[PDB]
Coordinates of C-alpha atoms and ligand atoms in Angstrom, one line a residue:
Chain Z
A3 CA -74.5 -10.3 59.7
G4 CA -71.3 -10.4 57.7
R5 CA -68.1 -12.2 57.1
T6 CA -66.1 -13.1 60.2
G7 CA -63.5 -15.3 58.7
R8 CA -60.4 -14.5 56.7
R9 CA -61.3 -12.7 53.5
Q10 CA -59.8 -13.5 50.1
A11 CA -58.8 -10.8 47.7
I12 CA -60.6 -10.6 44.3
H13 CA -58.8 -10.2 41.0
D14 CA -61.9 -8.8 39.2
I15 CA -65.3 -7.6 40.4
Chain S
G1 CA -55.1 29.8 65.7
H2 CA -55.0 26.3 66.9
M3 CA -51.3 26.2 67.6
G4 CA -49.1 28.8 69.3
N5 CA -45.8 30.0 68.0
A6 CA -43.6 27.2 69.4
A7 CA -46.0 24.4 68.3
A8 CA -46.5 25.8 64.8
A9 CA -42.8 26.2 64.2
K10 CA -42.0 22.7 65.5
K11 CA -44.7 21.2 63.3
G12 CA -43.6 23.1 60.2
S13 CA -40.0 22.0 60.7
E14 CA -41.1 18.4 61.4
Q15 CA -43.0 18.4 58.1
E16 CA -40.0 19.8 56.2
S17 CA -37.8 17.0 57.7
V18 CA -40.3 14.5 56.4
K19 CA -39.9 15.9 52.9
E20 CA -36.1 15.6 53.2
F21 CA -36.3 12.0 54.5
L22 CA -38.6 11.0 51.6
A23 CA -36.5 12.5 48.9
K24 CA -33.5 10.5 50.2
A25 CA -35.6 7.3 50.4
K26 CA -36.8 7.8 46.8
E27 CA -33.2 8.0 45.6
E28 CA -32.4 4.8 47.3
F29 CA -35.6 3.1 46.1
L30 CA -35.0 4.0 42.5
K31 CA -31.5 2.6 42.4
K32 CA -32.9 -0.8 43.5
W33 CA -36.0 -0.4 41.3
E34 CA -33.8 0.1 38.2
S35 CA -31.3 -2.7 39.1
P36 CA -33.4 -5.4 40.9
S37 CA -31.9 -8.3 42.8
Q38 CA -32.3 -11.8 41.4
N39 CA -31.3 -15.4 42.1
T40 CA -29.9 -14.7 45.6
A41 CA -30.4 -18.3 47.0
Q42 CA -31.5 -21.8 46.1
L43 CA -34.1 -24.2 47.7
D44 CA -31.3 -26.5 48.9
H45 CA -30.1 -23.8 51.3
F46 CA -33.1 -24.3 53.7
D47 CA -34.9 -26.9 55.6
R48 CA -38.7 -26.9 55.3
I49 CA -40.1 -27.0 58.8
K50 CA -43.8 -26.3 58.7
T51 CA -46.6 -24.7 56.6
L52 CA -47.7 -21.4 58.1
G53 CA -50.2 -19.9 55.6
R59 CA -48.0 -21.7 50.3
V60 CA -45.9 -19.9 52.9
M61 CA -43.5 -22.2 54.7
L62 CA -41.4 -21.7 57.8
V63 CA -37.9 -22.7 56.8
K64 CA -34.5 -22.8 58.5
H65 CA -31.4 -21.6 56.7
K66 CA -28.8 -24.3 57.0
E67 CA -25.7 -22.1 57.2
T68 CA -27.1 -19.4 59.6
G69 CA -29.8 -21.3 61.5
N70 CA -32.0 -18.3 60.9
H71 CA -35.7 -18.9 60.4
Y72 CA -37.6 -17.4 57.4
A73 CA -41.0 -17.4 55.8
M74 CA -40.7 -18.8 52.3
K75 CA -43.6 -17.9 50.0
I76 CA -44.1 -20.5 47.1
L77 CA -45.9 -19.5 43.9
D78 CA -46.8 -22.1 41.3
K79 CA -45.8 -20.5 38.0
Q80 CA -48.6 -22.3 36.1
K81 CA -51.3 -21.1 38.5
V82 CA -50.2 -17.5 38.2
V83 CA -50.6 -17.4 34.4
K84 CA -54.1 -19.0 34.5
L85 CA -55.1 -16.3 37.0
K86 CA -53.8 -13.3 35.0
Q87 CA -51.7 -12.3 38.0
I88 CA -48.4 -12.3 36.0
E89 CA -47.9 -8.6 36.1
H90 CA -49.1 -8.4 39.7
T91 CA -46.6 -11.1 40.7
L92 CA -43.8 -9.3 38.9
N93 CA -44.9 -6.1 40.6
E94 CA -44.8 -7.8 44.0
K95 CA -41.2 -9.1 43.8
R96 CA -39.8 -6.0 42.1
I97 CA -41.4 -3.7 44.8
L98 CA -40.5 -5.9 47.7
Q99 CA -36.8 -6.1 46.7
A100 CA -36.5 -2.3 46.3
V101 CA -38.3 -0.9 49.4
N102 CA -36.9 -0.4 52.9
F103 CA -39.0 0.7 55.9
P104 CA -39.3 -0.5 59.5
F105 CA -42.9 -1.8 59.1
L106 CA -42.5 -3.4 55.6
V107 CA -41.6 -7.1 55.6
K108 CA -38.1 -7.6 54.4
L109 CA -37.4 -9.8 51.4
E110 CA -34.1 -11.5 52.1
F111 CA -33.8 -13.9 49.1
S112 CA -35.6 -14.7 45.9
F113 CA -35.1 -17.3 43.2
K114 CA -37.0 -19.7 41.0
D115 CA -36.9 -23.2 39.4
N116 CA -38.8 -25.2 36.8
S117 CA -42.2 -25.0 38.6
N118 CA -42.3 -22.2 41.2
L119 CA -41.3 -18.7 42.2
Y120 CA -39.8 -18.3 45.7
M121 CA -39.8 -15.3 48.0
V122 CA -38.0 -15.7 51.3
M123 CA -38.9 -13.1 53.8
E124 CA -38.0 -12.4 57.4
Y125 CA -40.1 -14.6 59.8
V126 CA -42.6 -12.5 61.8
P127 CA -43.6 -14.8 64.7
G128 CA -46.4 -12.9 66.3
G129 CA -49.1 -14.0 63.9
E130 CA -51.7 -12.0 61.9
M131 CA -53.4 -9.0 63.5
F132 CA -56.6 -10.7 62.2
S133 CA -56.2 -13.5 64.8
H134 CA -55.6 -11.3 67.7
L135 CA -58.4 -8.9 66.8
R136 CA -60.9 -11.7 66.4
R137 CA -59.7 -13.3 69.7
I138 CA -59.9 -10.1 71.8
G139 CA -62.9 -8.7 69.9
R140 CA -61.8 -5.1 69.5
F141 CA -58.8 -3.0 70.3
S142 CA -59.1 0.0 72.5
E143 CA -58.6 3.4 70.7
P144 CA -55.0 3.8 72.0
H145 CA -54.2 0.3 70.8
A146 CA -55.8 0.8 67.4
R147 CA -54.0 4.2 67.2
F148 CA -50.6 2.6 67.8
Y149 CA -51.1 0.3 64.8
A150 CA -52.8 3.0 62.6
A151 CA -49.9 5.4 63.1
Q152 CA -47.6 2.7 61.6
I153 CA -49.8 2.3 58.6
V154 CA -50.0 6.1 58.1
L155 CA -46.2 6.3 58.1
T156 CA -45.9 3.3 55.8
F157 CA -48.4 4.7 53.3
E158 CA -46.7 8.1 53.4
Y159 CA -43.4 6.3 52.4
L160 CA -45.0 4.0 49.8
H161 CA -47.0 6.8 48.1
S162 CA -43.9 9.1 48.0
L163 CA -42.4 6.4 45.8
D164 CA -45.5 6.4 43.6
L165 CA -46.5 3.0 45.0
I166 CA -50.1 2.1 45.7
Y167 CA -50.6 -0.8 48.1
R168 CA -54.2 -1.9 47.4
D169 CA -54.7 -4.7 49.9
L170 CA -54.8 -3.3 53.4
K171 CA -56.6 -5.5 56.0
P172 CA -55.8 -7.2 59.3
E173 CA -55.1 -10.5 57.5
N174 CA -52.1 -8.8 55.8
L175 CA -50.5 -7.3 58.9
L176 CA -48.3 -9.3 61.1
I177 CA -47.2 -8.6 64.6
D178 CA -43.5 -8.8 65.4
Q179 CA -41.7 -9.7 68.6
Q180 CA -41.8 -6.1 69.8
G181 CA -45.5 -5.7 69.1
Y182 CA -45.0 -3.6 66.0
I183 CA -46.6 -4.2 62.5
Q184 CA -45.1 -5.8 59.5
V185 CA -47.0 -5.2 56.3
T186 CA -47.0 -8.3 54.0
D187 CA -48.8 -9.2 50.8
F188 CA -47.6 -6.9 48.1
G189 CA -49.4 -8.9 45.4
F190 CA -51.5 -6.0 44.4
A191 CA -49.0 -3.2 44.9
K192 CA -48.1 -1.2 41.9
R193 CA -46.0 1.7 40.8
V194 CA -48.4 4.2 39.5
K195 CA -47.6 7.8 38.6
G196 CA -51.2 9.0 38.4
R197 CA -54.2 6.7 37.9
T198 CA -54.7 3.0 37.4
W199 CA -57.7 0.9 36.5
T200 CA -57.4 -2.7 37.7
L201 CA -60.4 -4.0 39.7
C202 CA -58.6 -5.7 42.6
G203 CA -58.5 -5.9 46.4
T204 CA -60.7 -7.3 49.1
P205 CA -64.4 -6.4 49.1
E206 CA -64.8 -5.0 52.6
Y207 CA -61.8 -2.7 52.0
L208 CA -62.6 -1.5 48.4
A209 CA -62.9 2.2 47.9
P210 CA -66.1 3.3 46.0
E211 CA -64.2 4.5 42.9
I212 CA -62.8 0.9 42.5
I213 CA -66.3 -0.6 42.7
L214 CA -67.5 2.0 40.3
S215 CA -64.8 1.1 37.7
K216 CA -63.2 4.4 37.6
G217 CA -59.5 5.3 37.1
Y218 CA -58.3 5.7 40.6
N219 CA -55.2 6.8 42.5
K220 CA -53.4 6.3 45.8
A221 CA -56.4 7.7 47.8
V222 CA -57.9 4.2 47.7
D223 CA -55.3 3.3 50.3
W224 CA -56.5 6.1 52.6
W225 CA -60.0 4.9 52.3
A226 CA -58.8 1.4 53.2
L227 CA -57.0 2.9 56.2
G228 CA -60.4 4.2 57.3
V229 CA -61.9 0.7 57.0
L230 CA -58.9 -0.8 59.0
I231 CA -59.1 1.7 61.9
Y232 CA -62.9 1.2 62.1
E233 CA -62.5 -2.6 62.2
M234 CA -59.7 -2.5 64.7
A235 CA -61.8 -0.2 67.0
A236 CA -65.2 -1.9 66.5
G237 CA -64.2 -5.5 65.9
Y238 CA -66.1 -5.5 62.6
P239 CA -65.7 -3.4 59.4
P240 CA -68.0 -0.5 58.5
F241 CA -69.5 -2.2 55.3
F242 CA -70.5 -5.6 56.6
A243 CA -72.6 -8.1 54.7
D244 CA -72.6 -11.8 53.8
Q245 CA -72.2 -11.3 50.0
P246 CA -69.9 -9.0 48.1
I247 CA -72.7 -7.4 46.1
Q248 CA -74.3 -6.3 49.4
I249 CA -71.0 -5.1 50.6
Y250 CA -70.5 -3.0 47.5
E251 CA -73.9 -1.3 47.8
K252 CA -73.1 -0.1 51.3
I253 CA -69.6 1.2 50.3
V254 CA -70.9 3.5 47.5
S255 CA -73.9 4.8 49.5
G256 CA -71.9 7.5 51.4
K257 CA -73.3 6.3 54.7
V258 CA -71.4 4.9 57.7
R259 CA -72.7 4.1 61.2
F260 CA -70.4 4.0 64.3
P261 CA -70.5 2.1 67.6
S262 CA -71.6 4.3 70.5
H263 CA -68.2 3.7 72.2
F264 CA -66.3 5.5 69.4
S265 CA -64.9 8.8 70.4
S266 CA -66.0 11.9 68.5
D267 CA -62.4 12.4 67.4
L268 CA -62.3 8.9 65.9
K269 CA -65.7 9.4 64.2
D270 CA -64.5 12.7 62.6
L271 CA -61.3 11.1 61.4
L272 CA -63.2 8.1 59.9
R273 CA -65.8 10.3 58.2
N274 CA -62.9 12.1 56.5
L275 CA -61.2 8.9 55.4
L276 CA -64.4 7.0 54.4
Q277 CA -65.3 10.0 52.2
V278 CA -66.8 9.0 48.9
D279 CA -66.1 12.5 47.4
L280 CA -62.5 12.4 46.4
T281 CA -62.3 16.2 46.5
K282 CA -62.9 15.9 50.3
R283 CA -61.1 12.7 51.3
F284 CA -58.2 13.0 53.7
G285 CA -55.0 12.0 52.1
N286 CA -56.1 13.4 48.7
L287 CA -56.1 17.1 49.5
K288 CA -53.6 19.9 49.1
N289 CA -52.3 19.2 52.6
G290 CA -51.6 15.6 51.8
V291 CA -50.9 13.2 54.6
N292 CA -50.6 16.1 57.1
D293 CA -54.4 16.3 57.2
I294 CA -54.3 12.8 58.8
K295 CA -51.1 13.1 60.9
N296 CA -52.4 16.5 62.3
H297 CA -55.9 15.3 63.1
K298 CA -57.1 15.4 66.8
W299 CA -57.3 11.7 67.0
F300 CA -53.5 11.5 66.5
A301 CA -52.7 14.4 68.8
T302 CA -51.0 12.1 71.3
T303 CA -48.9 10.4 68.6
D304 CA -45.2 11.0 68.5
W305 CA -44.6 10.2 64.9
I306 CA -40.8 10.1 65.1
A307 CA -41.0 7.9 68.2
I308 CA -43.2 5.5 66.4
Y309 CA -40.8 5.4 63.4
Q310 CA -37.9 4.8 65.8
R311 CA -39.9 2.0 67.5
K312 CA -39.4 3.6 70.9
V313 CA -43.0 3.6 71.9
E314 CA -44.1 0.8 74.2
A315 CA -46.3 -1.6 72.3
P316 CA -49.8 -2.3 73.7
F317 CA -49.4 -6.1 73.2
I318 CA -46.3 -8.4 73.0
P319 CA -47.2 -11.7 71.3
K320 CA -46.2 -14.9 73.1
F321 CA -42.9 -16.2 71.8
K322 CA -41.4 -19.4 73.2
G323 CA -38.3 -19.5 70.9
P324 CA -36.8 -19.0 67.5
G325 CA -38.8 -21.7 65.7
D326 CA -42.1 -20.8 67.4
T327 CA -45.2 -21.1 65.3
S328 CA -47.8 -21.0 68.0
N329 CA -49.3 -17.8 66.7
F330 CA -50.2 -19.3 63.3
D331 CA -52.5 -22.1 62.2
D332 CA -51.8 -25.8 61.3
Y333 CA -52.0 -26.9 57.7
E334 CA -51.7 -30.4 56.1
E337 CA -44.8 -31.6 49.5
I338 CA -42.7 -29.6 47.0
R339 CA -43.0 -31.0 43.5
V340 CA -40.4 -29.5 41.2
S341 CA -41.0 -30.7 37.6
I342 CA -38.3 -31.9 35.1
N343 CA -39.5 -29.4 32.5
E344 CA -39.3 -25.6 33.2
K345 CA -42.7 -24.0 33.0
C346 CA -43.7 -20.4 31.9
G347 CA -40.0 -19.6 31.7
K348 CA -40.5 -16.6 29.3
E349 CA -43.3 -15.0 31.3
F350 CA -41.1 -14.8 34.5
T351 CA -37.7 -13.9 33.0
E352 CA -37.4 -10.8 35.1
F353 CA -38.2 -12.5 38.4
Ligands
7KB401 C1 -46.4 -16.7 58.1 C2 -45.5 -15.5 57.9 C3 -44.6 -15.1 58.9 N1 -43.5 -14.3 58.8 C4 -43.4 -13.7 57.6 C5 -44.3 -13.9 56.5 C6 -44.2 -13.2 55.3 C7 -45.1 -13.3 54.3 C8 -46.3 -14.0 54.5 C9 -46.5 -14.7 55.7 S1 -48.1 -15.3 56.0 O1 -48.5 -14.9 57.3 O2 -48.2 -16.7 55.6 N2 -49.0 -14.5 54.9 C10 -49.6 -15.1 53.7 C11 -50.8 -14.4 53.1 C12 -51.8 -14.0 54.2 N3 -51.5 -12.6 54.7 C13 -50.4 -12.6 55.7 C14 -49.1 -13.0 55.0 C15 -45.5 -14.7 56.7

C-alpha cells in the first residue's frame, strides 16, 4: 500500500 | 578490457567533447545569471484560456502563440518561507538553456502576484501516462531516463541542484520528449546545502537524516524515477511519510521479478545510501551512469539532438489542445502593492 495520487512537495520534514 | 581500441578511443573522445560543451554552456549561463531578465511582458498581453494545473493556458494576443502562465501569490510565498526558493526558481529558469528544460519566455509582476510565462507543453505530465498505462517497458523508461541524465549533467555542471525530480514534474512534448518543469527547489550550490525540501518518496537518505548534502541527491532521485517508470510504483512506498522515510534510510530495496539484471544493478548503484559508493558521486562522475550496461544501447548525442524516435507521441488535436491535462474550477490584482521589497529582484 502507498500513495498513488499526485504527491506534494514538502518545505520542511 | 571491456572495450577494444576503436570503442575506447571513441568513448574517451566523446567524453572530452562533453567537457568542451559544458564549459561553453557555463560561460553562457553565467552571463545570464549575472544579468537576469526582468519585466519582459505584462498581463494585458495575453488572453486567459483555461486553468491547467495556478498555471493557466494563455494566448498571446499579438502572436497567437499559446503559453503556460504560472501565477504566484506574493503574500502566500512569504507566509510559506519560500521567498528565496521562488527567487532561485525564476533566476535559474531565465539563465538556463537545454532541450529538455522548459523555456521561460516572459516574466513580470504586479501588486499581488509573480508571473512566469513558459512555453506550453501539450502532452501532459508523465505521471498521468504512467498511471494510465501502469508501467513503461525498459526501453521506454530508458528513453526518458537518458534525457534526465543529460539534463542533470548540464545542471550540475552549472553547480545547480534540481531537488524535485518526479513524474509529476516532467511534461511530454509534441515529439514525445521530456520537458523538466518545477524549478521551485532548484538552487545554485557550490558544495553542500542544508534545506529539508523535496517530495517524500524521492528524498535521498542524507536529506531525511538532516545532513549537509550535495548534487548526489539528484542521482538518488533518478534511481527512484527509473524504478517507478519501470515498475509503476516507487521503491519506497507507504501511506505516510514517516513510513516512507524509514524505508529510504534502511539501505534495502526490492525489485519486481520482471526487472532485468542490468536495470537492478544500475538502480542498486543509484539508490546507494553510502555516498562514497553512489553513482554520480564518484571520481568518474556522470560517466559511471552513462557507461553502465543498461544504457549500452543509448546514443547520447542522438538523444540530445532529438533524433531518436520517441516511444509514445501524445494525442494532439491542435494548438490550444488541453486534452492531456485535468479540468479545474479569477485573477484579483489588488490596489496596493504587496511584499514589494521581498521580490525586488524578480
Ligand atoms: C500545464 C503546463 C504545460 N506547459 C507548460 C507548463 C510549464 C510549467 C508548469 C506547467 S504544469 O503542468 O501546470 N505544472 C505545475 C506544477 C505541477 N508539475 C508540472 C508542472 C505547464
